[PDB]
């Protein structure tokens, strides 16, 4: 019932419609890196000189659930334990138990101006048709406007639409036995569409993205694996 409910539903449903489509067999999409179960793809797109390069990654992370992965991705209290591209951030507003607006500044990359971002971050469970099947969990981070964080002259305001979409697969054990983490897999689709908000040199931006996206996916998924080990499974 907060004011962004309609916008949230739009962004989430657009991800469920378009962000899970195949890119492995798409000629416009290029494999950047493959390491283990992680695959990172990019489509090279510049629009009026501005590098927009859609990014899509997939991963399959043993021993964690989608609910767990999304909780850790969304929870600002653990953000600094895994995120390495930020200088500073704060929660601007709490909209609901599952939705917040965050302001953050990113590490500066020479020669371009420092970027900042202002986004709504929402975590949502998408039920299957019935409880016979696993729900999908999604975290969506998308730029919004807010009076407490106006455009400023110190940073260029980037515009983002990012999603982490998690499906959980279980190999059920025999008879009356308990489910172990060894028999759960979380399939992650991560999509980032970032508009740098103003001019930036293409070669510079592209090398940083190519480095930072897989670094993040490896570091973040390992972090969740580490922190959930020995804890009861949260489905
Ligand atoms: C040490 C170099 C770092 C430079 C970082 C400058 C990027 C500024 C543009 C805004 C990027 C928004 C990233 C999305 C963040 C949130 O959803 C979330 C929680 O923070 N983290 C990720 O999704 C994890 C996202 C991982 C970020 C990958 C890096 C993106 C590179 C894109 C190229 C822009 C370069 C900036 C212009 C010079």
Residue 194: CB within 6 Å of ligand 1?
Answer: yes
Torsion-angle region of 143 (φ positive above 0: left; ψ -120 to 50: alpha; else: beta): beta
Residues 6+ apart with CB under 8 A from 216: 82, 83, 84, 85
The verdict on whether residue 213 carries a ligand-binding annotation is: no
- State the Cα–Cα distance between residues 141 and 23, nearest whole angstrom: 21
Helices (H) and strands (E) in the chain, counts: 4, 12
Distances (CA, A) of 164 to 35, 42, 121, 176: 19, 16, 11, 33
Q: In the numeric block, which tokens belong to residue 87?
A: 């200088």
Domain of 149 in residue numbering reads as: 1-235
Distances (CA, A) of 12 to 47, 91, 150, 161, 178: 25, 21, 25, 10, 33
Q: Going along the chain, which residue ranges are E strands?
A: 29-35, 38-43, 46-47, 50-51, 55-62, 86-96, 99-106, 115-126, 136-143, 156-157, 159-170, 184-195
Residue 159 CA, chain-centre distance (Å), reads: 14
Q: In the numeric block, which tokens belong to residue 195?
A: 């508009």
Query: The domain spanning residue 235 has which CATH number?
Result: 3.30.530.20
Please tell me the experimental approach by which this structure was elucidated. Answer: X-ray
In ligand 1, which atom is closest to the CA atom of 117?
Answer: 10
- State the Cα–Cα distance between residues 53 and 71, nearest whole angstrom: 27
Other C-beta atoms within 10 Å of 232: how many? Answer: 6
Contact predicate 72/227, CB 8 Å:
yes
Residue 191: CB within 6 Å of ligand 1?
Answer: no
Which residue shows structure tokens 């103003």? Answer: 198
PDB resolution in Å: 1.4
Three-state DSSP state, 216 = helix
Q: In the numeric block, which tokens belong to residue 149?
A: 């964080």
> Strand 50-51 vs strand 115-126: parallel, antiparallel, or unpaired?
unpaired
Q: How many domains does the chain have?
A: 1
Burial status of residue 165 (CB atoms within 10 A of its CB: 0-12, 13-18, 19 or more): buried
In ligand 1, which atom is closest to the CA atom of 112?
Answer: 38
Distances (CA, A) of 89 to 15, 48, 147, 198: 25, 30, 16, 21
Residue 218: CB within 6 Å of ligand 1?
Answer: no
Burial status of residue 65 (CB atoms within 10 A of its CB: 0-12, 13-18, 19 or more): buried
Residue 197: CB within 6 Å of ligand 1?
Answer: no
Best substitution site from 76, 189, 194, 204 to test ligand 1's pocket, by max atoms within 8 Å of Cβ?
Answer: 194
For residue 140, report the distance from its CA to the centre of ligand 1, in Å. Answer: 15
Best substitution site from 57, 70, 85, 89 to test ligand 1's pocket, by max atoms within 8 Å of Cβ?
Answer: 85
- State the Cα–Cα distance between residues 83 and 81, nearest whole angstrom: 6
Q: Report the candidate in 47, 54, 44 with the shortest Cα–Cα distance to residue 189.
A: 54
- State the Cα–Cα distance between residues 182 and 185, nearest whole angstrom: 8
User: Residue 107 gets which letter from DSSP?
Assistant: P
Residue 83: CB within 6 Å of ligand 1?
Answer: yes
- State the Cα–Cα distance between residues 20 and 56, nearest whole angstrom: 9
Three-state DSSP state, 10 = helix
Residues 6+ apart with CB under 8 A from 132: none
Q: Identify the residue whose C-alpha is closest to ligand 1 atom 30.
A: 209
């Amino acid at each position: 019932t907060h004011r962004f409910v309609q916008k949230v539903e739009e962004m989430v449903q657009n991800h469920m419609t378009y962000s899970l489509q195949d890119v492995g067999g798409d000629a416009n999409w290029q494999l950047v890196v493959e390491e283990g179960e992680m695959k990172v793809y990019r489509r090279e797109v510049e629009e009026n000189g501005i590098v927009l390069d859609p990014l899509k990654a997939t991963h399959a992370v043993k021993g964690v659930t989608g609910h767990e992965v999304c909780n850790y991705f969304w929870n600002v209290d653990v953000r600094n334990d895994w995120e390495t591209t930020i200088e500073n951030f704060h929660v601007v507003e709490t909209l609901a138990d599952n939705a917040i607006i965050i302001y953050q500044t990113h590490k500066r990359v020479w020669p371009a101006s420092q970027r900042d971002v202002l986004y709504l971050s929402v975590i949502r469970k998408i039920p299957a048709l019935t409880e016979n099947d696993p729900e999908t969990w999604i975290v969506c981070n998308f730029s919004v406007d807010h009076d407490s964080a106006p455009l400023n002259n110190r940073c260029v305001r980037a515009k983002i639409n990012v999603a982490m979409i998690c499906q959980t697969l279980v190999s059920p054990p025999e008879g009356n036995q308990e489910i172990s983490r060894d028999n759960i897999l979380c399939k992650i689709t991560y999509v980032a569409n970032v508009n740098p908000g103003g001019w930036a040199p293409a070669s510079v931006l592209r090398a940083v993205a190519k480095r930072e996206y897989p670094k993040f996916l490896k570091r973040f998924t390992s972090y969740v694996q580490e922190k959930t080990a020995g804890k009861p499974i949260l489905f």
